[PDB]
Design a protein around this ligand. Sequence first.
Ligand SMILES: CCCCn1c(Cc2cc(OC)ccc2OC)nc2c(N)nc(F)nc21
Length: 208
Amino acid sequence: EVETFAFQAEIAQLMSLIINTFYSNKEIFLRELISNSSDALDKIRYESLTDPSKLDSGKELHINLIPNKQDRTLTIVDTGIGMTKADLINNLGTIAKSGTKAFMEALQAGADISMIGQFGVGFYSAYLVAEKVTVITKHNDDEQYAWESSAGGSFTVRTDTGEPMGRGTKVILHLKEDQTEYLEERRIKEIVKKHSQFIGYPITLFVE
Ligand SMILES: CCCCn1c(Cc2cc(OC)ccc2OC)nc2c(N)nc(F)nc21
């Protein structure tokens, strides 16, 4: 069954802002998502040092970028720590509240949208380019969940029946009609080179 949740007022407001503000430098969405993957891979890396069994659901620590022109999606896949249902429904929104407020104040003093990640809310930059985001995630202590939102003030969570993923997180960007340039091999490569050149895990760009 599909559960529908409201965003806390502040996130909904960050989300509208990201959708509504005129801002051409949309490409920074990719570095934000990659950096979130990097923090997650680090974390499962740290946790297995004192418990190697936390790696039984997969030993490879990596990042895959998969475009699919047929569906119109850019999926960012990591094998990092993954998210529990608690994360999805309460915890992530709890921690995001403060980062949101800070961010939203800075945008005045002179800051701009490319700085969202210095506040820990770079995930919602997904909405510069995607009309819908689907997030498939699997943590060691929980089952596999699908989170989803087209913004609008609500998101859903359901247990995922798709392909089992071991451990990690897939962010599936359903691109806006005018943003298919992020399906293109040479565009993604350019972006990864300029902003994500020095990540500590292999990034494999899949071709179509
Ligand atoms: C805010 C940092 C933690 C949340 N997070 C994020 C940021 C994030 C994801 C969300 O998914 C529905 C929602 C909100 C988020 O940040 C506020 N990306 C992650 C990732 N790839 N892997 C893991 F494991 N955790 C992630």
